[PDB]
Amino acid sequence: IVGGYTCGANTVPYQVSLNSGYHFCGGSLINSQWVVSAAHCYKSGIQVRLGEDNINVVEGNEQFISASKSIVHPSYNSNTLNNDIMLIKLKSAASLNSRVASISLPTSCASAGTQCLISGWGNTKSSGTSYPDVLKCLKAPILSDSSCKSAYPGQITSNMFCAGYLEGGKDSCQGDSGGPVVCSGKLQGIVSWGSGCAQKNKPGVYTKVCNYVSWIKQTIASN
């Protein structure tokens, strides 16, 4: 997260991270056994970590649970990043509490201007590279589809939306992928891609979760 602030330990209780050798993506806990993250985060042999703040210290509230199933959307395209959503089943259910809690799925789509919370452990610089110890947070408004499409001509599908600032300075970044974009208590977005981070007229692009609520249900109920 570039130009964000320090969330505070366990203030974002649905935030999880995806691990294989290091932190490489975020994710969102949507129930005790299922994580929603980005399809381009797919890896064999993943471990999900829940209840973290300082990823580099064992603080006491963590749960590290192996991923038993990783179900990439069947229409996922890795060139265009169309349908960049993944469901991860946990090997055993997370113990839910004040610091490990699920986030609600949307019941309708969010409109332009809706302020959202974006979180992750990704890069905090747009000019360089710095990876934070503690979870970072960003408040960002969803942008109109018009300015989004203009920012990235011919690249935005109806399964993506932009959020952030046309003037730059605040954005999600490398390592934030799969992470939550939460608007009024609902998971509306998954950190997907962008052209650099926090650049002028290059807002971050996000998986439009409200498109996938039915696909998520069916997948959870068949797996």
Binding site: G21, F24, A38, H40, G122, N123, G128, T129, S192, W193
Partner: protein, 176 residues
């Protein structure tokens, strides 16, 4: 911007006669430029040439619309400028893990049959000292995954690059 050994921004290949850089190890005593060791077909291992050995020239490229300069944290195709039969390209990529010299690793390779269109996306990441960088290897240009770092492996006396390994830092040096 990513700067070269002279402090000038590293230029991307946007057509015409593209700008070229060797990639030198920035380790104290000697570097030797990055170069190729034949593996198979049109494929080579990316390794560090002996000292005083010229490295191979590398061109850096990106998708259309990109500004002409290499930016920190961004992702680029790395391509050696080297004579080649036209069925082969020279783009770098993350290789399948293998055992070689009693070493198990995923090497960085360069080159493949052009039609497979294989290449990985490499990222220059900053270091405590300006003009000195760590490379990272990505499977995507614009996606916000955090890529694994590239490091070095001592394989039968030769220093080869792969995912992980030993701390390895570089400078970009202009060519010609």
């Amino acid at each position: 911007p990513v700067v070269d050994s002279d402090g000038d921004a590293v230029q991307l290949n946007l057509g015409g006669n593209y700008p070229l850089y060797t990639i030198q190890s920035a380790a104290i005593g000697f570097r030797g430029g990055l170069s190729t060791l034949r593996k198979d077909a049109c494929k080579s291992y990316v390794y560090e040439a002996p000292e005083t050995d010229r490295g191979l020239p590398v061109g850096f490229s990106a998708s259309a619309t990109s500004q002409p300069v290499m930016q920190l944290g961004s992702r680029y195709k790395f391509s050696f400028s080297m004579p080649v039969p036209l069925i082969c390209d020279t783009a770098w990529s993350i290789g399948k893990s293998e055992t070689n010299g009693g070493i198990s690793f995923q090497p960085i390779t360069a080159g493949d049959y052009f039609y497979l269109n294989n290449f990985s996306w490499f990222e220059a990441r900053s270091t405590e000292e300006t003009g000195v960088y760590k490379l990272a290897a990505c499977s995507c240009e614009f996606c916000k995954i955090a890529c694994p770092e590239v490091g070095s492996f001592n394989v039968n006396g030769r220093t080869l690059l792969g995912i992980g390994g030993e701390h390895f830092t570089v400078q970009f040096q202009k060519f010609d």
